[PDB]
Enzyme design. Structure first.
Site, PDB file in Angstrom:
ATOM      1  N   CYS A  84      -5.017  -2.815  -0.688  1.00 46.61           N
ATOM      2  CA  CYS A  84      -4.414  -3.127  -1.974  1.00 46.61           C
ATOM      3  C   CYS A  84      -5.321  -2.532  -3.070  1.00 46.61           C
ATOM      4  CB  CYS A  84      -4.338  -4.648  -2.153  1.00 46.61           C
ATOM      5  SG  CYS A  84      -3.865  -5.121  -3.801  1.00 46.61           S
ATOM      6  N   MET A  92      -9.337  -6.924   0.217  1.00 46.05           N
ATOM      7  CA  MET A  92      -7.929  -6.885   0.601  1.00 46.05           C
ATOM      8  C   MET A  92      -7.595  -5.501   1.167  1.00 46.05           C
ATOM      9  SD  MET A  92      -4.617  -8.317  -1.394  1.00 46.05           S
ATOM     10  CE  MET A  92      -3.057  -8.315  -0.475  1.00 46.05           C
TER      11      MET A  92
END
Ligand SMILES: [Cu+]
Length: 99
Positions: A84, A92
């Protein structure tokens, strides 16, 4: 395979983050918590000759609302690392193996 974008406790994680699949099987990344999020495959960490643009959001693109999804099916075998963009340093990230 459904993948949550953000865990149910608010953690900035893909759930699951490491997983396998076979060629043509849907991955549905679903906004869960801590959104906006996105899914970007790392162009230097996917199988030979794969076009990352065909399977990725751009880094500037976002899923904004809870329950929004990004669906991709992968074809070529091997390891694909993804992240991400806005939350990469928070951890992430993930890796899917097409086998
Ligand atoms: Cu994110």
């Amino acid at each position: 395979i459904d993948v949550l974008l953000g865990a149910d406790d608010g953690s900035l994680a893909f759930v699951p983050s490491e997983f396998s699949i076979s060629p043509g099987e849907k991955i549905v990344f679903k906004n869960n918590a801590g959104f906006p999020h996105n899914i970007v495959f790392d162009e230097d960490s996917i199988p030979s000759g794969v076009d990352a643009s065909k399977i990725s959001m751009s880094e500037e693109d976002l899923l904004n609302a809870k329950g929004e999804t990004f669906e991709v099916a992968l074809s070529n075998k091997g390891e694909y690392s993804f992240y991400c963009s806005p939350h990469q340093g928070a951890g992430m990230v993930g890796k899917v193996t097409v086998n």
